[PDB]
Amino acid sequence: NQTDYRIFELNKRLQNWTEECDNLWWDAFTTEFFEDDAMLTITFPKRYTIGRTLIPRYFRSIFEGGATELYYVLKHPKEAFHSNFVSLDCDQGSMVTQHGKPMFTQVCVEGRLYLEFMFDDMMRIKTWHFSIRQHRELIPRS
Amino acid sequence: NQTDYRIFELNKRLQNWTEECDNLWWDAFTTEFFEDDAMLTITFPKRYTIGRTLIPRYFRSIFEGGATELYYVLKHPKEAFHSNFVSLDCDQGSMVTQHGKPMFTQVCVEGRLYLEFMFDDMMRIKTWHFSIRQHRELIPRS
């Protein structure tokens, strides 16, 4: 499956993040995975859509929100090829973040993730739509 | 990176698990990912090693222990090709499990994971060694 491997790669680049990561690093990350005309939409029923120029700031904001790790889990995603793009539709999608040492908490935002990738060599994200269902904060036993 | 993609695939097959999964299903899962002469070692400093014939029972035991999900996260794994096998060495390896609805807790066993894969077409696991450092149980805010 060609598409969910792009999300494996996206999760892997986010592992390279340190607290000493430049704004030029987020530009390089975004340029690797997103088209120059990419649109990212978060749905809570308040719907917010950001253009390509803010996608780097979106991902940075999550870490500057306190997060140390960020990875996406896609349970049974449906891949379909179209003339213009490849679609990835996942109802059971999880956005997971590990937070600072003092709090040492994990946030698991569950919802539907819909992605349209360019049907070319780079396989960059054209559309990112995440419709959030549930919001879970897990705290340790210690 | 050829090896950590095998662990992406291993995580993906474990998503297909339901509570109505036969013992023949675990034989099929193990046959996909492990050689017929595979060895699996867990280190806590009590060291236990199981042969190929018990590897299906090991993975089943985790779910029959109450777990609904099981996936492995490998942070910066080192891949090296040798004459006989391909090696995957990950100091920052995480074994993650989501537990039953009543408790609704998540266990995150952290440690070093060392894997030797067959340097052939199937890329099946010859050696599985997981040296556990820390053991974390996360409970929800609700």
Curated annotation (Swiss-Prot), chains A, B:
Expressed in multiple adult tissues including heart, brain, liver, kidney, testis, lung and muscle, with expression highest in the pituitary gland and skin. It is found in: Nucleus. Ubiquitinated by RLIM/RNF12, leading to its degradation by the proteasome. Interacts with ESR1. Forms homodimers and heterodimers. Interacts with and activates LHX1/LIM1. Interacts with the LIM domains of ISL1 and LMO2. Can assemble in a complex with LMO2 and TAL1/SCL but does not interact with TAL1/SCL directly. Strongly interacts with the LIM2 domain of LMX1A and more weakly with the LIM1 domain. Homodimerization is not required for, and does not effect, LMX1A-binding. Component of a nuclear TAL-1 complex composed at least of CBFA2T3, LDB1, TAL1 and TCF3. Interacts with LHX6 and LHX9. Belongs to the LDB family. The dimerization domain is located in the N-terminus. Binds to the LIM domain of a wide variety of LIM domain-containing transcription factors. May regulate the transcriptional activity of LIM-containing proteins by determining specific partner interactions. Plays a role in the development of interneurons and motor neurons in cooperation with LHX3 and ISL1. Acts synergistically with LHX1/LIM1 in axis formation and activation of gene expression. Acts with LMO2 in the regulation of red blood cell development, maintaining erythroid precursors in an immature state. This is LIM domain-binding protein 1. It comes from Mus musculus (Mouse). The lineage of its organism: Eukaryota, Metazoa, Chordata, Craniata, Vertebrata. The chain holds residues 65 to 211 of 411 of the full protein.
